[PDB]
Amino acid sequence: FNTAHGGNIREPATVLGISPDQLLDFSANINPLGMPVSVKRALIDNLDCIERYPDADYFHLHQALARHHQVPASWILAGNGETESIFTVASGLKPRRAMIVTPGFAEYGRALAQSGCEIRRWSLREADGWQLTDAILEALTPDLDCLFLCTPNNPTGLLPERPLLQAIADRCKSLNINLILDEAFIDFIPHETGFIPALKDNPHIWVLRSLTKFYAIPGLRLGYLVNSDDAAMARMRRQQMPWSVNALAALAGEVALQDSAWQQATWHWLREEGARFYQALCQLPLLTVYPGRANYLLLRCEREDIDLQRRLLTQRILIRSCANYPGLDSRYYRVAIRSAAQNERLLAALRNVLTGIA
Amino acid sequence: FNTAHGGNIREPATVLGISPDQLLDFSANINPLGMPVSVKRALIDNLDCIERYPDADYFHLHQALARHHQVPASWILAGNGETESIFTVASGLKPRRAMIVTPGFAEYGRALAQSGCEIRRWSLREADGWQLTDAILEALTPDLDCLFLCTPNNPTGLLPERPLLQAIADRCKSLNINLILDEAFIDFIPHETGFIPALKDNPHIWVLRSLTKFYAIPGLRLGYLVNSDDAAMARMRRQQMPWSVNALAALAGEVALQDSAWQQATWHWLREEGARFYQALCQLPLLTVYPGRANYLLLRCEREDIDLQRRLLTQRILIRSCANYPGLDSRYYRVAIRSAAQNERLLAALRNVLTGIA
Domain count of chain A? Predict the structure, then answer.
């Protein structure tokens, strides 16, 4: 099969002729700790709120997000998943010319194509280990309207250094280029604040955030966009679709942000099991594992003519094939980092495929 | 205040300086019976499904909708509320020239404007009691790409006769005009099948449906579009935003359609309390009440210089002001039809404002 996004367990299970609950999914990167306790309680206790429309202005949710980031509520716009925020920014900025970095999340290109923009692709290089380098600076030109970066990048998991991002931000300010930073996974990286704390003096920077992966609520759909340009955000708001965020997602979001132990618990797990996982994967023969900073890792299979996703699916483990990402080929795959036990089943499966081969 | 849509209880309460739970809302038209029992159970029992992304293809939901209408599943596309279905059809059909009927739901014009279409408005007339007449047929011309009708119309509640809709449908087929029928409230009208049963031989007809009002789940956000043109629907699907429908909405939708007593219970209430409500409203002096067919009624206040919404809000009852609808003015308002008790509070409030006045 050829799926545009991971997490397609129903489709994968159908390919094998079995029930989705029989697959162990490593193709979507959801926090393994599961749904925050308080969130589950809040949903059960306030389920009747679905009998009314959500607040079209999402006052409570926006206030919660603003309190969390200590920024004016006017700088924030919640969306039906960060995927909606990507389409919102693309349609609201309507760039004539925009640059994206490949490989990267497919939706940037989809949103830009539909908005009628001329798309330029800045290609990351295998020889550079897929890292974003300062070579992109010379590629930025006055005629560019937007530049979209993913920090960290999906699927490589690599995080551009702060100095390089500042240099890019500064050149964009100077060349009148809007800089959109997709921080969907920034919460997972222990010491990483992102750019929200620097928007006050940078109205040309837009930050995309998601709550689905970090708080394990991808099924609720919730993300948001943050920007300090009063006029531009007003435009995003008046052009938006009404009631995009469902009432339970708004509730879960507000509650999730109250859990003051969640961030630490997640970072500890990533620091312990996540590092142990990277290590074990690197020990496997015929496999290159890139140093991802969040809860997923890009793998490059060195074994010739072998479909790792097909072989692991036979063992009822679903992984992401990155062959469809521009710039990557059939040797590349991506796996989530999950609980130790689940990670152990993935490793044992990879070993059967890669161990004892000349 | 000037709200684009009703149901704005948080905004209304803020205007008065009180909590939203202190207002009785007649400005949104949600089934008063509340959430179907089975739906509530299903949500509570399957709450953990939000830990995974929804099925991007919504296999189970689409199969349920197809079984319900006895049509191929390929003819259906679920959306994040019928509002999303309106934007989907507008963006997917990208009409160069389109006609809408005013007054009508505001989102048609919003979706068309953003899609860059030349909008023509067919004006309903106060002298006709706001009924759609065959005069529109001569207004249809070959250069039209789309014609959007609301059946029944919002806010008038009037349902164009089947013969007129067939005549419009036939002329559209002949002039190569796509006909989009918004059946959001068709479920409330006792003997009304809508056009889904006639799409097989009419690929130029698109039907919009909503589950939020009839099953009282506006907070979950769920609607869908139905059309029999294989190629056109394929286009709507490949151009769509991924995971638009949240997992709980998909679950509620499937379950709600299983309640075989819901339709009857709702029609009975509308036949009893709804008729008694129309009658009581007509007895009030200085007030014209249009004969709405679903769960809402358009009111025209005959009392000079009186803001009925402002006066009722002082009594903690929120109603819809239709002054913002093109074609209507400050004399027009809309109220939901709710439970007998709630309807009794609205009537007593209207009486204090309209009774005993020369």
Answer: 2
Residues B176 and B316 in one domain: no
Give the CATH number, domain containing residue B309.
3.90.1150.10
From the list A30, A83, A246, which residue is nearest B242 (CB)? A83
Contact B13, B23 (CB under 8 A): yes
User: Tokens standing for A123?
Assistant: 């290609």
User: Do A10 and A25 form a contact (C-beta atoms < 8 A)?
Assistant: no
Among candidates B53, B80, B219 on the partner chain, residue whose Cβ is nearest the Cβ of A53: B219
**Resolution in angstrom units:** 1.8
Helix (H, G, I), strand (E, B) or coil at B225: strand
Residues B337, B188 contacting (CB under 8 angstroms): no
Same domain, B254 and B324: no
Judgement on whether residues B137 and B211 belong to the same structural domain of the protein:
yes
A353 Cβ contact list (under 8 Å, min separation 6): A303, A306, A308, A311, A312
User: A295 lies in which domain range?
Assistant: 5-34+260-358
Is residue A253 a known part of a binding site? no
In this structure, are B82 and B160 located in the same domain? yes
| A63 and A19 within one domain | no
- Write down the residue that tokens 């306790």 correspond to: A37
- In Å, how far is A44's CA from the nearest CA of chain B? 6
The domain boundary, picked from A232, A259, A286, lies at A259
Q: Do A219 and B9 touch (CB under 8 A)?
A: no
Residue B234: which H helix or E strand, with range?
helix B230-238
CB contact under 8 A, A52 and B35: no
Closest CA of chain B from A41, distance in Å: 10
Which of A259, A278, A297 is the last residue in one of the domains?
Answer: A259
| Beta carbon pairs, A and B, within 8 Å | 146
Chain A touched by B9 (CB under 8 Å): yes
Q: In what order do the strands lie in the sheet with B332-336?
A: B287-289, B296-301, B332-336, B320-321
Residue with token string 């097989």: B200
Nearest to B216 by CA among B262, B150, B273: B262
Q: Please state the separation of Cα A214 from the chain's center in Å.
A: 10
Segment holding B64, helix H or strand E: helix B59-69
Residues 225-264 of B with CB under 8 A from A: 239, 241-244, 246-249, 252
d(CA B58, CA B242): 11
The answer to whether residues A140 and A99 touch, using CB atoms and an 8 Å cutoff, is yes
Q: Shortest Cα distance from B7 to chain A (angstroms)? A: 7
Give the SS3 label for residue A38: helix
Look at A28 and B59 and tell me if their CB atoms are within 8 Å: no
Q: How far is CA B343 from the centre of its chain?
A: 20
**Do residues B315 and B238 both lie within one domain?**
no
A80 vs B: CB within 8 A: yes
Cβ contact B226:B207 at 8 Å: yes
Return the SS3 of B282: helix
Alpha-carbon dihedral angle through residues B139, B142, B147, B151, given to the nearest 10 degrees: 60
Q: Which residues of B touch A217 (CB under 8 A)?
A: 50-51
CATH number at residue A238: 3.40.640.10
Residues B58 and B14 in one domain: no
Cβ contact B241–A87 (<8 Å): yes
How far does B332 lie from chain A, in Å, by closest CA?
23
**What is the rounded distance in angstroms from the CA atom of residue B247 to the CA atom of residue A238?**
27
CB of A1 within 8 Å of a chain B CB? The answer is no
Q: Which residue of B has its CA nearest to A13?
A: B55
Query: How far apart (Å, rounded) are the C-alpha atoms in residues A207 and A90?
Result: 13
Do B251 and B281 belong to one domain?
no
A-chain CB neighbours of B30 within 8 Å are: 51-53
Q: Find out whether A292 is annotated in a ligand binding site.
A: no
